[PDB]
Amino acid sequence: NVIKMKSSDFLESAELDSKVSLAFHRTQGLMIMKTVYKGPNCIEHNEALLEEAKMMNRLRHSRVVKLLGVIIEEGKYSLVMEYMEKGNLMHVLKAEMSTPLSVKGRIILEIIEGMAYLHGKGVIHKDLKPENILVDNDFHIKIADLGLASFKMWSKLNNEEHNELREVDGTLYYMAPEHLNDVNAKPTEKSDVYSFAVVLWAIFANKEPYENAIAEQQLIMAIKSGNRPDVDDITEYCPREIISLMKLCWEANPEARPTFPGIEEKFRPFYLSQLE
Amino acid sequence: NVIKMKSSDFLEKVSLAFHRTQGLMIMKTVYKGPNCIEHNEALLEEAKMMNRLRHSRVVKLLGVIIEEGKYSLVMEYMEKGNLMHVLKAEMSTPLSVKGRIILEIIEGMAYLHGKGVIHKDLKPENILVDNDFHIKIADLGLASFKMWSKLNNEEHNELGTLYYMAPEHLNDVNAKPTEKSDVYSFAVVLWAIFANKEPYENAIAEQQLIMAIKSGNRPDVDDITEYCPREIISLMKLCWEANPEARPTFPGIEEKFRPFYLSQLE
Ligand SMILES: CC(C)(C(=O)N1C[C@@H]2C[C@H]1c1ccccc1O2)C(F)F
Ligand SMILES: CC(C)(C(=O)N1C[C@@H]2C[C@H]1c1ccccc1O2)C(F)F
Ligand SMILES: [Cl-]
């Protein structure tokens, strides 16, 4: 069941850099709060938002970010989630203290475990990227869906005329070429395997791909016609097997890519023998 | 789909099996004898059902041999054997490894319950261990697979149980197992992990012990002469409650136990 929380239960809410904000619950401590809508009171979709909140609460796994509660009040709808101290994956990869190969290896296997969990329950992420991989103080990771790609009613609630905190309209580096300039195409398990491929590269590069691209359409068309992250831009020691894995996972044809159980079967013994 | 394998694909009853292209496996050969032709369709459909369970903490069925007079399940190799065999070795298992063994057991049982499977026979013999001390839950007695289990116990075929069983099933074979039946087994598996031996060694009859267990008696916590933490003793007492409804679920165990493992034991 979903825990129904109140705004009075939280003392202060400091907006943090990437509205997502750090929130101190008065009895249960530090949490993250995605406040999705703030505005005038319209109680139209509350049944579907709560049922969608129930569905996202059913997804329980050690490598998936738990929804802890929801604030469903007059003119404010928030999601409340667990706190992951080191922030997102790209924030950790850019830090002054460098992350060793064993921790990187463990990060990749935890990513695989979490994606396997979600695919096992029929969920396609549709938006796997470093920003959606959150890291605790022991370097263990949890996958989030901060763009609300799996949850239509909460995502549509953001894009509304009444909303003061409206999204006026990063993702495209990790979006599979079949989806670039193709809004109608249905994402699959294979779409996420592409994103993962680009996440692997990023883990060994310590940065976002495609730094030298100038315009958006230049990049879109480049990626659709075969261009990938530059493998020679990996300065530090990435093993041969992980480079082979990312090239396999960023195949142009979806059916040429492996699935996440197939990745895990290959990767886990490699992690244990070579990296741990 | 299930991979249909051949005897010619292997070089050799439970035995070590070398697949000619894929290396070492275990082959549980359930039947060897004359040709039983009728229920090969049900055996293959039951083989398909056991093939749907893919998880790092569950033994994968790699294939099945369904041939003239010979029926075998082929599964992954686990070098150190069952959990009880590893707990009895001359080199002791440290507390951190034991903690990780418990978490892997929890992960696997949560996987299985997530796919609607009740194990119904969780015990150290069904927990296999690899050379790095990582574990996988097995169903070596085919408790979830009636046609394959009945195929073993057949007239033509030429080829300790009670200690982990919840009291609701002792002297009540008709009662339906639940997720909570496995939670009791796990509770007794925890005890065993810190004792390095089977429970109830000093009991002298089956019927005495069964009725004792049904009326609340449990494995002896004073028999633990290693450091078992306080909160794991609290966890096993919670998990071996007489009333099934009083027991936690495996997601409930994990929520408590994982952060305990991470902060205190890792
Ligand atoms: C609460 C939110 C949506 C969240 O991370 N999740 C909800 C559930 C588990 C987790 C999640 C991760 C990835 C895909 C689906 C999904 O669904 C958060 F991002 F606000
Ligand atoms: C092949 C056998 C039966 C096996 O362990 N399993 C089959 C599938 C996954 C795994 C398993 C474990 C536990 C319960 C059911 C189950 O069903 C092996 F013991 F021979
Ligand atoms: Cl957890």
Side-chain angles (χ1 to χ4, degrees):
Chain A
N1 291 20
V2 174
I3 297 163
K4 291 144 184 167
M5 287 168 178
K6 300 201 84 187
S7 297
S8 68
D9 301 338
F10 295 91
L11 312 185
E12 301 296 338
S13 61
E15 294 128 53
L16 60 76
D17 184 20
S18 191
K19 315 297 172 177
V20 183
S21 55
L22 191 57
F24 190 81
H25 197 250
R26 200 180 279 91
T27 67
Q28 302 177 30
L30 217 48
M31 299 173 174
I32 296 295
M33 191 169 72
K34 184 162 186 83
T35 301
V36 170
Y37 171 100
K38 196 171 279 165
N41 191 21
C42 331
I43 206 184
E44 297 183 312
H45 293 90
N46 287 34
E47 295 191 309
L49 292 164
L50 184 60
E51 197 259 338
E52 198 156 282
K54 284 171 183 179
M55 286 190 295
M56 71 177 51
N57 198 254
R58 285 179 182 177
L59 301 162
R60 294 273 197 184
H61 197 244
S62 71
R63 321 305 178 196
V64 178
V65 174
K66 292 162 185 164
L67 183 87
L68 298 167
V70 295
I71 302 168
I72 300 298
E73 293 174 344
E74 61 203 321
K76 55 190 132 177
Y77 307 94
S78 300
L79 299 166
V80 181
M81 35 163 286
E82 62 181 330
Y83 178 52
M84 297 293 280
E85 301 107 297
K86 293 190 167 273
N88 68 37
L89 180 62
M90 190 63 66
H91 186 267
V92 174
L93 297 166
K94 293 177 160 169
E96 70 191 315
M97 192 173 182
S98 208
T99 316
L101 181 55
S102 57
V103 174
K104 287 185 181 189
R106 202 177 62 181
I107 287 163
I108 294 159
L109 184 51
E110 288 178 349
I111 287 158
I112 294 154
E113 283 168 14
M115 294 314 302
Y117 174 76
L118 294 169
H119 288 197
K121 309 286 272 187
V123 181
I124 305 101
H125 202 301
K126 313 156 181 181
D127 199 10
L128 176 63
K129 64 196 156 173
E131 275 197 58
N132 273 327
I133 294 162
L134 307 190
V135 186
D136 71 34
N137 254 308
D138 294 309
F139 293 91
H140 297 289
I141 68 97
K142 293 179 194 283
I143 298 148
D145 181 22
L146 299 170
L148 305 170
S150 302
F151 305 109
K152 290 293 101 208
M153 300 301 96
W154 285 85
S155 73
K156 289 281 186 177
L157 180 59
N158 194 340
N159 297 114
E160 198 193 324
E161 296 182 311
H162 299 116
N163 197 7
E164 289 181 310
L165 309 175
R166 190 182 185 164
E167 191 172 45
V168 179
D169 194 70
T171 298
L172 303 172
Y173 302 147
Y174 310 94
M175 183 166 279
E178 61 264 27
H179 302 300
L180 301 171
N181 289 12
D182 194 346
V183 180
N184 191 52
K186 297 173 187 178
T188 65
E189 295 182 5
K190 265 54 188 197
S191 309
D192 291 340
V193 172
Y194 187 91
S195 299
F196 176 77
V198 186
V199 176
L200 287 180
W201 187 87
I203 285 167
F204 293 91
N206 302 313
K207 58 184 189 173
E208 301 241 72
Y210 311 121
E211 68 187 359
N212 295 333
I214 316 304
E216 193 161 288
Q217 291 304 323
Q218 179 213 11
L219 183 60
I220 289 155
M221 245 64 69
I223 297 154
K224 287 181 83 71
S225 76
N227 263 57
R228 299 294 185 268
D230 181 32
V231 178
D232 298 315
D233 207 23
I234 294 163
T235 311
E236 63 165 63
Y237 181 64
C238 184
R240 292 178 182 184
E241 292 93 328
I242 291 164
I243 291 161
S244 292
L245 181 56
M246 71 181 71
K247 293 178 174 191
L248 192 53
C249 295
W250 72 43
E251 280 292 319
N253 179 19
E255 206 60 46
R257 304 166 197 164
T259 178
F260 281 106
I263 291 165
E264 194 180 354
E265 283 170 304
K266 295 175 179 187
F267 194 76
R268 180 179 293 278
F270 175 81
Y271 170 70
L272 298 174
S273 53
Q274 313 312 316
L275 311 187
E276 192 166 64
Chain B
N1 285 38
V2 71
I3 295 164
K4 287 178 190 173
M5 290 180 153
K6 300 190 172 182
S7 292
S8 68
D9 298 346
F10 290 93
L11 320 172
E12 291 198 42
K13 306 201 179 178
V14 184
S15 56
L16 297 165
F18 278 96
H19 196 258
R20 280 189 170 276
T21 66
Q22 292 187 350
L24 190 58
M25 295 160 179
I26 306 152
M27 189 164 70
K28 182 154 186 158
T29 303
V30 304
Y31 181 98
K32 262 178 181 163
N35 188 25
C36 45
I37 324 195
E38 296 176 49
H39 295 90
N40 293 7
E41 290 155 300
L43 291 165
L44 188 60
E45 194 79 67
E46 199 161 283
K48 284 173 188 176
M49 289 292 286
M50 69 169 75
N51 204 254
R52 87 204 188 79
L53 306 169
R54 297 222 173 286
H55 199 245
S56 70
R57 320 305 177 200
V58 187
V59 169
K60 288 168 179 136
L61 181 83
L62 293 166
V64 293
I65 301 186
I66 297 165
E67 292 181 330
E68 194 88 317
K70 193 199 163 183
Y71 302 87
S72 305
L73 303 173
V74 178
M75 35 166 285
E76 53 191 346
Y77 178 54
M78 295 296 280
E79 187 165 358
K80 292 191 159 280
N82 63 42
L83 184 58
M84 192 53 53
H85 188 268
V86 176
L87 291 162
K88 290 184 168 181
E90 288 173 46
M91 300 306 303
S92 98
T93 308
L95 176 59
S96 297
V97 171
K98 287 188 181 189
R100 197 188 61 192
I101 288 161
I102 292 159
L103 189 54
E104 289 177 339
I105 293 156
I106 295 153
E107 284 169 15
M109 294 304 295
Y111 174 73
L112 291 177
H113 288 196
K115 308 293 284 154
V117 171
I118 314 306
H119 200 301
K120 308 161 275 268
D121 199 15
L122 177 65
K123 62 195 170 183
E125 272 170 294
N126 272 325
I127 293 168
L128 312 184
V129 182
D130 66 39
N131 207 234
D132 294 309
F133 298 90
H134 300 290
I135 68 97
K136 295 183 207 286
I137 297 137
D139 181 26
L140 298 170
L142 302 163
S144 292
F145 309 107
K146 295 174 184 176
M147 213 63 65
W148 284 89
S149 72
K150 289 164 185 175
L151 179 58
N152 189 188
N153 195 0
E154 198 183 321
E155 206 173 311
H156 284 308
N157 189 21
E158 71 175 51
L159 298 162
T161 52
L162 300 172
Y163 297 161
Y164 306 87
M165 192 172 277
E168 60 262 37
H169 303 296
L170 302 179
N171 293 2
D172 194 346
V173 297
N174 294 324
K176 307 273 172 184
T178 65
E179 296 175 344
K180 305 306 182 70
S181 307
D182 290 347
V183 176
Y184 185 96
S185 301
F186 176 72
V188 185
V189 173
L190 291 178
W191 187 90
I193 285 156
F194 291 89
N196 306 25
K197 58 192 193 168
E198 293 289 338
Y200 309 117
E201 70 202 40
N202 69 327
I204 212 68
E206 289 276 72
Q207 187 56 29
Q208 291 191 323
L209 179 53
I210 286 158
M211 295 289 288
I213 294 155
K214 285 188 79 65
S215 74
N217 295 105
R218 294 289 183 270
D220 189 22
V221 178
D222 297 317
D223 256 326
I224 295 159
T225 58
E226 181 185 308
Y227 182 63
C228 188
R230 296 198 295 95
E231 43 274 76
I232 290 166
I233 299 163
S234 296
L235 179 55
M236 72 175 74
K237 289 168 173 200
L238 193 72
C239 294
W240 74 38
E241 284 291 324
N243 192 347
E245 293 254 57
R247 299 168 202 167
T249 57
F250 278 104
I253 288 163
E254 198 175 16
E255 282 170 302
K256 298 166 193 186
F257 194 78
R258 182 175 290 276
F260 173 74
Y261 172 71
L262 290 162
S263 52
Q264 297 252 239
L265 304 181
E266 193 171 62

